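Reopening: structure tokens for the magnesium ion complex, inputs below.
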Amino acid sequence: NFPTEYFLNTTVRLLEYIRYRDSNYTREERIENLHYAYNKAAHHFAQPRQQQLLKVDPKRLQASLQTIVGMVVYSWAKVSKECMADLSIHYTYTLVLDDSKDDPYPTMVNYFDDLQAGREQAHPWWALVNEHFPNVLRHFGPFCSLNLIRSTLDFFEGCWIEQYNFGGFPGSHDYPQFLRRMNGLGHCVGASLWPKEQFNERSLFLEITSAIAQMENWMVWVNDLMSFYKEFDDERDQISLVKNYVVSDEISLHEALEKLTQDTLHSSKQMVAVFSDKDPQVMDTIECFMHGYVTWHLCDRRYRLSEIYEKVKEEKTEDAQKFCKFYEQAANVGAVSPSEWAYPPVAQLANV
Amino acid sequence: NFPTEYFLNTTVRLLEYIRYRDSNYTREERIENLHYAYNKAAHHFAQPRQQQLLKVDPKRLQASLQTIVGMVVYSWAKVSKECMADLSIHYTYTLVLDDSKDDPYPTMVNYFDDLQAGREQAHPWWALVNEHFPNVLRHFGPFCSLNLIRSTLDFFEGCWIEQYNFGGFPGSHDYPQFLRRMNGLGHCVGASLWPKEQFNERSLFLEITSAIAQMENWMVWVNDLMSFYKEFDDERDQISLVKNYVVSDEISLHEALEKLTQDTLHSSKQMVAVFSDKDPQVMDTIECFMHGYVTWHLCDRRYRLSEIYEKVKEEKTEDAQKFCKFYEQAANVGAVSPSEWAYPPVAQLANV
Ligand SMILES: CC[N+](CC)(CC)Cc1ccccc1
Ligand SMILES: [Mg+2]
Ligand SMILES: [Mg+2]
Ligand SMILES: [Mg+2]
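Re-run output (same inputs, fresh job):
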């Protein structure tokens, strides 16, 4: 019984308030990048070693690779082409784990010993991610790298904790954000926004650190919101910030939703206050990520918000009128045919 | 300036909530443990490798190791002697890194590659800490270990950031929590309260995870609260959670203090509220930690809370007397002369 209606009352405030307006790229640029990124990642995930260690249903690997290339490209609009590709590999790995089961425990028992000795991790995921990492890290200075590493690590714990579908003992007010922060790849996204070929870690240490701290919550709440739909009646997505707010904080799915919104709205207000007068170049990237990020949410299959445009394309509310007005802008700019960039299929590359 | 009355009220409330009371920890036992831990550690830090790779003025090392042994022994009341010893070494390392003013950049440049390769780290602090870690992790299961490994890493970055003496951009509301969390060592503390020889993560996963989640905030805010007296006039330490709230949030020092207190009390309440009915054995570890922690704050000279007792030992106010009650209780069990356990000095062990 997805609340609907109210969903719009939320989405609209956010979009209207952040003055949603994806302006980055040109149809003739957007595709150049979608294809470049998809091409490298797909060639990578098609190798035998990757194919044999990453346990993923071919179909899901493909859908994920596409949702990721879409995310990297639409949000990291100011980084190099190579950078998007390598980021797309790293984020495609994390998405595989985010949607998977399997118990880590058995393989994580000698984690730190194998680490300190230089011995491939028992867990296949760690074995492939740690092997690939260097191709992501080369694009960054040391500090931003630490952030990427830590975050990827935290995210690993989060997925683990998530495998107990636990929303927290009622009255464990802290639990909710504790868990969301742990699996939101906050510091990983925020730091990967600053390639060294384009930024000087030491010269912009303060702005970059501030961006990591602030963007962590914006980035995650916006997703907690936009994807409230697709994560509604799905297992594994059963445990979400909103849903755990209810359990742990003891309130109604209606209030928890208002909570997430009042927050998201504030994060947004402070992003601007803080980064407006600062280095134009920084603002530009934050700006592009924020708009591009929303464009992707209103366009990728994963979040399937189409099943809402075509479910309210009728209800003439001053609310669902704005929602649809927005959804339109989005697809208009970011709705592309996979037939123009996502090819050939990863599988087809694998059996060669 | 200085809310002597307001502080007292908040302190008594916090002590009340957590039920600050009579431990079953006998003063003769406290001394057994204080000496055991101090001894293994002093012998460790007196090793030559340690002696030449750890840059710390001998007197501060001596003092630091002592403050730590006290903190551990008085708070990890239910763990074995070896456990207290090994945690005492790891926590002394961390505390010692704040004395370092050296830029992590040059040594962090090849962090990930040396790591993945199994080559000794460039930054000496890492070389020692990572080499000693097994000595600590062996006391815990895999889950709990991951947590320690992560916090220590987050800790390293926080030190890095703190080197910039930056309290946050005005309006960057998410910065103080971000930073305090970065170097709070929360998930480390929380996860180190459950040795595998006494608990089973698999069976108590949700209880443990939840503790980590709530303890992270409790432990850091309670420390920020007790430290609020010594740091009040400390022009040296410019960036403290509260002082950052002042700058980042743009509020009066008093308003920020008001913020900490609310979070601290509320955090305390929810602690009990959530763990009273839970496994008895677990609530004991929690219940005891909170008490010794406070006992330690009340007893370690570094916080100079005795200066307060010396200024309200006669007022006939309910708060003022309640305070003294608790203090004399703590002094009763905790006030122990260093001569009784901390010997011989590390310096003397080093020449031998
Ligand atoms: C990158 C962070 N994200 C983006 C939608 C929001 C918290 C979740 C995510 C996790 C794992 C793979 C892809 C996306
Ligand atoms: Mg996830
Ligand atoms: Mg998910
Ligand atoms: Mg979500």
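The radius of gyration of chain A is 20 Å. The longest helix of chain A spans residues 253-276. Marking as resolved unless the reporter disagrees.
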